């Protein structure tokens, strides 16, 4: 059978997401988008996905950009302009 090798040989990379003064160690697949991250973190941190501004390389990431398209890798320091209160 022709195995679809598009979604294979992948793994969970380490994302260091900074909630202002809280560094949160995450692990996701490069298949996901930075928007997908907003959706994953929303039920966990309870902060609006619109407010969750992911900023890496001094560059804000777009909903369409995946971890690969966002230059993100295992050990990437992601600045998150969010609200802790």
Swiss-Prot record:
Natural source organism: Arabidopsis thaliana
Q: What sequence ranges are listed for the domain Ubiquitin-like?
A: 13-85
Superkingdom, taxonomy of origin: Eukaryota
Q: Under what name is this protein listed?
A: LRR repeats and ubiquitin-like domain-containing protein At2g30105
């Amino acid at each position: 059978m022709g195995h679809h090798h598009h979604h294979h040989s992948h793994s969970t990379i380490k994302l260091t997401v900074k909630f202002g003064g809280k560094s949160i160690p995450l692990s996701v697949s490069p298949d996901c988008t930075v928007k997908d991250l907003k959706s994953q973190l929303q039920p966990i941190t309870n902060v609006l996905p619109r407010g969750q501004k992911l900023i890496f390389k001094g560059k804000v990431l777009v909903e369409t950009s995946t971890l690969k398209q966002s230059d993100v890798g295992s050990g990437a320091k992601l600045m998150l302009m969010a609200s802790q209160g």
